[PDB]
Write a protein that binds this ligand. Structure first.
Ligand SMILES: CCC[C@@H](NC(=O)c1ccc2oc(=O)[nH]c2c1)[C@@H](O)c1ccccc1C
Length: 352
């Protein structure tokens, strides 16, 4: 009842999250393990040898155990699922490959990119750095009907190849707000629109994670899992999270009475993938020794720029437990058919 690559995508999600969280603790985290991995698995089609193996190993695929055909077939099925009209009403995903004009491109790569990964490849004049950046940004804008604006802020002069990966999700629950205090830290407090409700929720307190665990369903076949840590236990929560633990919560359908304070938050994350994935061991494709002969046979080529942007916008006689999501919390968003991790992150400052 899951896609073959879902455990690998879950391991990739934890690796990417833990890297970002180890760097800074006062920063929001918001990315799509699915869209980033789809993009680099699509890119691997134009790569060979160590450049190739490094990308797939960097996405947590063990090439001695998983045949490469099962990886691409896994990604194609996941894309097939996400591109269903009901999911398309809530979720927009895209990859744009921008290659220098004057490069002789391999027809097989351009066809496989389109047929297997529903991505777009474009010819751009990197000789005009400012116009190159505008054509890339206008493609993302047109793709997200104006939601993502000026994604790329700076391009290197040597840029010959840019990768842009974006995902936009409109959050609307499957089935009258008021402002309230959000305790970012002990000396910081912001105000957020909070939905107050008493109802039967899929919520539980976990002793292993020392957190309240809330599951909620959204249109587009998506389930969000919110982890609200106990005082001083956010790091313990981040450390103890595993794919098996998350699968067991997703399996739980038991509800209880609870009074919840839920913040109506929209969230965004922007990442320099050359930097982030470099720390995960994906370096060859961004260096002069890159084997991109599947993209262009004659000329040297390296991936100069790779950017990710993720956007989420919201469209018993005993006194029941009162759970307020009014302080930093971790979350995952799963696609229901595949169990794939669509999003992963942490809200620490809702105004950041
Ligand atoms: C902890 C929950 C965060 C979450 N909130 C909601 O879905 C949400 C709240 C209030 C609402 O009032 C409405 O009328 N509709 C609403 C929806 C949402 O902001 C979020 C945060 C981080 C990751 C994913 C999501 C969906």
């Amino acid at each position: 009842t899951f896609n073959k690559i879902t455990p690998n995508l879950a391991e990739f999600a934890f690796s990417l999250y833990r890297q970002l969280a180890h760097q800074s603790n006062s920063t929001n985290i918001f990315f799509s393990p699915v869209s980033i991995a789809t993009a680099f698995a699509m890119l691997s089609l134009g790569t060979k040898a160590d450049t190739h193996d490094e990308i797939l190993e960097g996405l947590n695929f063990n090439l001695t155990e998983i045949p490469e055909a099962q990886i691409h077939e896994g990604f194609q099925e996941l894309l097939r699922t996400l591109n269903q009209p009901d999911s398309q009403l809530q979720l927009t995903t895209g990859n744009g490959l921008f290659l220098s004009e004057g490069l002789k491109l391999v027809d097989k790569f351009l066809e496989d990119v389109k047929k297997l990964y529903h991505s777009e490849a474009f010819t751009v004049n990197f000789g005009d750095t400012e116009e190159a950046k505008k054509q890339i940004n206008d493609y993302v804008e047109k793709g997200t009907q104006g939601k993502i604006v000026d994604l790329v802020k700076e391009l290197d002069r040597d840029t010959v190849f840019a990768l842009v990966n974006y995902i936009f999700f409109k959050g609307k629950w499957e089935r009258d707000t008021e402002e309230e205090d959000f305790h970012v830290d002990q000396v910081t407090t912001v105000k957020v629109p909070m939905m107050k409700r008493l109802g039967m929720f899929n919520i539980q307190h976990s002793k292993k994670l020392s957190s309240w665990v809330l599951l909620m369903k959204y249109l587009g076949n998506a389930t969000a899992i919110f982890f609200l840590p106990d005082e001083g236990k956010l790091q313990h929560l981040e450390n103890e999270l595993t794919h098996d633990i998350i699968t067991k919560f997703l399996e739980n359908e038991d509800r209880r009475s609870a009074s919840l304070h839920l913040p109506k938050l929209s969230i965004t994350g922007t990442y320099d993938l050359k930097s982030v994935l470099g720390q995960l061991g994906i370096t060859k494709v961004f260096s002069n020794g890159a084997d991109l002969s599947g993209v262009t046979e004659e000329a040297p080529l390296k991936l100069s720029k790779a950017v990710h942007k993720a956007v989420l916008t919201i469209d018993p006689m005993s006194i029941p437990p009162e759970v307020k999501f009014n302080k930093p919390f971790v979350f995952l968003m799963i696609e229901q058919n595949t169990k794939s991790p669509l999003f992963m992150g942490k809200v620490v400052n809702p105004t950041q």
